[PDB]
């Protein structure tokens, strides 16, 4: 009454209360389906998240082993002639440069992968748009193909 018009459309055709109950049961079914769909969605999301956590932890452990070996060698790194090890500033500069380049290639890999997936989806869409028109899309030329026969 406060939002929609107060006019009642009782002069229309008598919509069946059976139809109303059908729509109510459809609403209940759609709500339940929403529930179970979000159930599976959360299930797969959590599975992906845990797998990503495991992969990231393995990557981190291997990366830190590599970095510890790198630093072990780096402080070992002293000139052959002067025998003065690598300047700590020079080692830090190398570390920053290497980490930045690796990270940059990493987001490049992210973007390339996502763009390539979007690519595959776009070729799939282009092929899938074979539907004729309107309206009857495939059966139309199927019967049309019948006469071509």
């Amino acid at each position: 009454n406060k939002n929609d018009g107060f006019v009642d459309r009782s002069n229309e055709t008598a919509m069946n209360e059976h139809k109303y109950l059908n729509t109510l049961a459809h609403v209940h079914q759609i709500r339940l389906d929403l529930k179970q769909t979000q159930t599976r969605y959360n299930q797969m999301s959590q599975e992906l998240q845990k797998k990503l956590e495991q992969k990231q932890k393995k990557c981190n452990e291997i990366k830190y082993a590599f970095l510890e070996l790198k630093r072990e060698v780096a402080k070992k790194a002293a000139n052959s002639r002067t025998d003065k090890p690598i300047p700590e500033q020079q080692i830090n500069e190398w570390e920053k440069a290497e980490l930045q380049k690796s990270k940059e290639l990493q987001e490049l890999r992210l973007q390339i992968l996502r763009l390539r997936n979007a690519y595959v989806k776009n070729q799939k869409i282009l092929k899938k748009k074979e539907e004729l028109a309107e309206g009857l899309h495939l059966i139309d030329f199927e019967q049309l193909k019948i006469e071509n026969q």
Binding site: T37, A65, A97
Partner: protein, 97 residues
């Protein structure tokens, strides 16, 4: 809800794949560095490692990965044209439909 959950799924899967690739490349770099330094990067006369060889290895690795980035950019440009053409094709097909 289905759209949002699906999208979070693709985000998680993309992060998975990129983390796997990061692991792969990090371990490849670890192998390369260990081969280059712990095998041929330590001073023999003094018993220490050499600073200059570690230098050259750092700059060479950075240059190689930056060439990787340059080829990445070339592929990204190619894919930019391809994406533009595909978007035009999809929009025209939708309009005709």
């Amino acid at each position: 809800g289905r759209i949002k959950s699906d999208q979070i799924l693709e985000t998680l899967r993309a992060i998975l794949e990129e983390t796997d690739m990061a692991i792969t490349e990090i371990r490849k770099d670890a192998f390369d560095f260990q081969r280059e330094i712990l095998v041929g990067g330590e001073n023999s006369r003094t018993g220490k490692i050499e600073a200059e060889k570690i230098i050259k290895f750092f700059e060479e690795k950075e240059r190689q990965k930056d060439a990787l980035i340059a080829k990445y950019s070339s592929k990204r440009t190619n894919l930019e044209r391809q994406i533009l053409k595909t978007n035009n094709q999809i929009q025209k097909k939708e309009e005709m439909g």
